[model samples]
Target: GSSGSSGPDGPTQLRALNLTEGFAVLHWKPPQNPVDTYDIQVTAPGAPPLQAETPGSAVDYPLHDLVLHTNYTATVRGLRGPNLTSPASITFTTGLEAPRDLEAKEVTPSGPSSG
Candidate 1:
């Protein structure tokens, strides 16, 4: 029983999770037939991309302290036991800056009180 087992095949599924103000989490489910690992990448709106290698089936990558006020994209691919990445990928966008401070207009309630 040293070799891999024989089981039903399953589709490849991977996605990016919880994309927030300054971070994004990546998660994926391994194939039912089993594979080597996964290939993951994170790309910002206007910056160089980052890549990472995950071993042993499913994986999760956490990208932290990312730049604010910009777009973002991510992708996850399955490695078919020989460093082969699947074509599956995903994309996302970060939050934008908050609205500027708004001051109330100085109201002068004038009826018969105005001299």
Candidate 2:
């Protein structure tokens, strides 16, 4: 679904897909203007903001090394000449990694050893 427009004109149909345990793809429909480039801003828990610029022709940006089972938010903006379009944002959560360190414990009251 397309969100309301922002800036002079903004990207539309913003969405995200979890490609793998620590990977995702962010997508958006570019604006009418012939953008020179696109900017992607990604943020996750306990991590500094990550930014990248992609060629205008690209509609999807593949993100790698994402945090497993952690939520992330990303925004995309189109840059046309000196104009910086408004951002379209989407939130997503990465998939959980394989379960590790299986363990089991039995609880018992502290007492003298029983034969």
What's the lDDT for candidate 2?
0.74
TM-score of 2: 0.68
| Candidate 1 Cα errors over 4 Å, as ranges | 1-11, 19-22, 83-85, 96-115
What is the per-residue lDDT of model 2 for residues 7-81, given as tens digits with 9 covering 90 to 100? 345576787654764668887876666577888899977866888888877778888777756787888887776
The candidate maximizing TM-score is 2
User: In model 2, which runs have C-alpha deviations exceeding 4 angstroms?
Assistant: 1-8, 18-22, 96-115
Query: What would the per-residue lDDT of candidate 1 be over residues 1-115, giving only the tens digit for each residue?
Result: 4997443222246564665555667666555556566566677757778887666544566766555555556666666644564545666544433445235455678678555
Best by lDDT: 2
Return the lDDT, model 1, position 55. 62
Q: For every model shown, what is its TM-score relative to the native structure?
A: 0.56, 0.68
Q: Which window of 10 residues has the lowest lDDT sum in candidate 2? A: 96-105
In model 2, residue pairs whose N, Cα or C atoms come closer than 3 Å (at least 3 residues apart or on different chains), thus clashing, are none
* Clashing pairs for predicted structure model 1, backbone only: none
